[PDB]
Design a protein around this nucleic acid. Structure first.
Ligand SMILES: [K+]
Ligand SMILES: [K+]
Ligand SMILES: [K+]
Ligand SMILES: [K+]
Length: 683
RNA sequence: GGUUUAGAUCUAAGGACUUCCUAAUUAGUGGUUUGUCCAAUGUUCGGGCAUGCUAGACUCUGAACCC
């Protein structure tokens, strides 16, 4: 939990490698960072460590001198500036190859540190093996400093000593303390600075978030500018000079970019003039208060009533919350028609989706939409919601195993302020960011923008697809918000719904149908039967479903007994339990339950396979599998709450895990004791 | 029969706290007393892992592997 990778991410800059040097500090400045990282003025330290100040001062000046004479210009051109105007297929093909970036990182590192600074040649390869490890680190993935030091022989650092071998115990304690400071300074101050100097590293919005992509600044600045000037024409406005400001962040896609705008806490000018650590502290703590007590309550009340709008109102019934609820509804529709027919008629189906649903959202229709769910109520009314708090605010007892209110007369005010005043900061060619508001839509990344689309399209479905609920036993649709699917039994109702999507009537709400991905399938015995909806392989005749079988790979179980099996699953359960998946703002609360079970299920059916293999050799103990479950369950609910910061539905998620594992233990009859233990989990 | 090795103790050498004296500032050097300290420190549900463990002794207790 010492070396984090997010420090390197998203650091864009236009470099000039003619006069360039990575170390920005001096020999006396790095010295304090090595001997006493907590506080400066190493003269306060003990007299025995000053005895070795000369050696620590000597080696740093040598790598600095090498840094000053390091011809970065020749390195860039030789290894990572062979680009050509090829117009490659997909954005991630422009990235520097991972073998190349580690090569450039190491050869710069190699010419920076002499083997004295590496601690011999046998330690140099060890440190290099951890430098490539840090490069393989995912976006959120961290690295423990003790792991980095495992294998590095301290005795070989004679410049870290007085010049002789380790004499006493006290000499060992301080030499190790000095080694930690140095090695940590190597990665934080040099390694992270090396990658930051040459590559804009991004998060590769497609799957396997542990993969980071290294884009050369020259390449990236050309790629983003081209894409952002096309986006600016339709979506952005140059505006004149907080809580409605964010920094734009376009992440790669299949030949495109997904424009995310991560909100910014600092004010309009406290971001520019960052040289005051008195104002930014007073403003970054305004944002945390703005969310918990003013921005979270408005979001909580919106959803809490849309759940009653989705059930009661027929129009919002077509709106879905999770990917699995679409499968159930068609399977209930499958069984609903078999009440009287019992021989399913020829079915007709269509699928379509909206282009840039967030970026095209009609702001004027949005304000009317939110007013629609408050139209029935009064205006000077106050809704109530419960407080959740952070996982740090659970200090009743460590090692985990009330109300709040806001007036709806103000919640409608803060909604409009997020639709109107939302403005991003794109970096100009000069290098200084500019302010841009939105012509249409709302930024992807703003908290309220999530539910803003969910409520609009639910209103949209209600106000437009009124024909399709007359004799709903024949046909019914599901939203799954950015997609759409419709199932019918007669051509009469299919011809009427196809007209509306192919007409401009739907783009009043700001929803433009993507006709390029609009598929039609009929069970006419020769047209088609197989079709794939979002995560559902829906058959036009039997309505069977198997979702991917693919999205999370096999654990490739080979391990022996007893607890070597468990260890591999633990480390490769949290790795598949990325905090991007558990994001409450990005995905739905119900959708998190689905994917957390898929990660859960694959690591329990692989247990049963290799359970009987080593069952003859070793009989498992019914109390070593308990603490395994306790750790797996605890680390899941702790990861889910700490990523969001709130604890919305932590009990909800709790009695989904202990449910999906009580059914994954049907084998091994008389497993009662461990199953009964799963029930008591409440704290 | 062969290989490897531990702790205790003794002696010598060095190291670490603490007062006094160093033409030291990309500097931190060298003598020193009136008490102490020289083996672990991290890490992992008392065993492993990583780093560290001066030099001798026919002083004492031993240990592990192969034939
Ligand atoms: K020493
Ligand atoms: K011996
Ligand atoms: K010995
Ligand atoms: K000994």
């Amino acid at each position: 939990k010492w070396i984090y990778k997010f420090d390197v991410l998203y650091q864009s800059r236009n470099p000039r490698y003619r006069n360039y040097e990575i170390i920005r500090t001096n020999v006396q400045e790095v010295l304090a960072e090595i001997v006493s990282p907590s506080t400066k003025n190493p003269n306060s330290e003990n007299p025995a460590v000053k005895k070795r100040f000369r050696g620590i001062k000597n080696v740093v000046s040598r790598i600095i001198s090498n840094d000053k004479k390091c011809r970065y210009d020749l390195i860039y051109n030789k290894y990572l500036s062979s680009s050509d105007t090829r117009k490659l297929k997909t954005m991630i093909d422009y990235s520097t190859k991972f073998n190349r970036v580690v090569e450039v990182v190491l050869i710069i590192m190699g010419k920076l540190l002499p083997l004295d600074a590496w601690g011999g040649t046998e330690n140099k390869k060890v440190i290099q093996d951890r430098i490539v490890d840090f490069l393989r680190l995912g976006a959120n993935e961290r690295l423990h400093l003790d792991d980095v030091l495992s294998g590095i022989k301290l005795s070989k650092f004679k410049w870290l000593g007085v010049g002789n071998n380790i004499s006493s115990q006290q000499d060992f304690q301080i030499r190790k303390r000095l080694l930690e400071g140095y090695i940590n300074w190597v990665f934080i101050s040099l390694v992270k600075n090396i990658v930051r100097a040459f590559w804009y590293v991004t998060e590769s919005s497609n799957m396997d978030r542990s993969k980071l992509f290294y884009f050369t600044h020259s390449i990236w600045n050309e790629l983003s500018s081209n894409w952002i000037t096309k986006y600016a024409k339709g979506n952005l406005v140059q505006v004149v000079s907080q809580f409605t400001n964010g920094k734009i962040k376009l992440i790669p896609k299949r030949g495109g970019f997904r424009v995310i705008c991560v909100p910014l806490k600092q004010s309009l000018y406290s971001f520019n003039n960052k040289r005051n650590f008195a104002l930014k502290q007073k403003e970054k703590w305004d944002y945390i208060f703005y969310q918990k007590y003013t921005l979270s309550p408005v979001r909580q009340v919106l959803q809490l009533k849309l759940n009653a709008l989705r059930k009661s109102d027929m129009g919002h019934r077509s709106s879905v919350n999770s990917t699995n609820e679409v499968a159930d509804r068609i399977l209930t529709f499958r069984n609903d028609l078999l009440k009287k027919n019992k021989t399913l008629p020829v079915l007709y189906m269509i699928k379509f989706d909206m282009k840039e649903c967030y970026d095209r959202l009609n702001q004027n229709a949005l304000k009317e939409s939110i007013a629609g769910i408050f139209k029935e109520d009064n205006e000077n009314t106050t809704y109530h919601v419960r407080e959740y708090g952070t996982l740090d605010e659970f200090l009743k007892l460590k090692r985990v195993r009330k109300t709040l209110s806001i007036s709806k007369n103000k919640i409608i005010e803060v909604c409009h302020s997020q639709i109107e005043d939302a403005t991003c900061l794109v970096k100009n060619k000069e290098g200084q960011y500019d302010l841009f508001k939105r012509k249409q839509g709302v930024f992807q990344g703003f908290s309220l923008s999530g539910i803003f689309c969910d409520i609009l399209y639910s209103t949209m479905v209600s106000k437009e697809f009124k024909f399709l609920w007359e004799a709903t036993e024949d046909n019914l649709l599901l939203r799954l918000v950015d997609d759409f699917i419709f199932i019918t039994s007669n051509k009469d109702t299919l011809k009427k719904v196809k007209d509306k999507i192919s007409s401009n009537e739907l783009q009043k709400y700001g929803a433009f149908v993507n006709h390029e991905k609009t598929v039609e399938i009929n069970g006419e015995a020769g047209s088609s039967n197989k079709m794939t909806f979002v995560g559902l392989d829906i058959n036009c005749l039997t309505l069977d479903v198997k979702k991917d079988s693919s999205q999370f790979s096999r654990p490739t179980c080979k391990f022996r007994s007893f607890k070597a099996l468990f260890s591999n699953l633990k480390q490769f359960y949290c790795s598949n339990l990325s905090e991007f998946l558990l994001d409450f703002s990005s995905n739905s609360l119900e959708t998190i339950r689905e994917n957390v079970d898929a990660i859960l299920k694959l690591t329990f059916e692989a247990i049963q396979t290799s359970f009987a293999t080593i069952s003859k050799q070793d009989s498992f103990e019914r109390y070593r599998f308990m603490k395994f479950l306790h750790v797996i369950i605890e680390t899941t609910i702790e990861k889910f709450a700490r990523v969001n910061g709130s604890m919305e539905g932590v009990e909800y998620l709790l009695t989904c895990i202990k449910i999906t594992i009580t059914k994954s233990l049907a084998f091994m009859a008389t497993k009662q004791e461990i199953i009964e233990w799963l029930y008591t989990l409440t704290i």
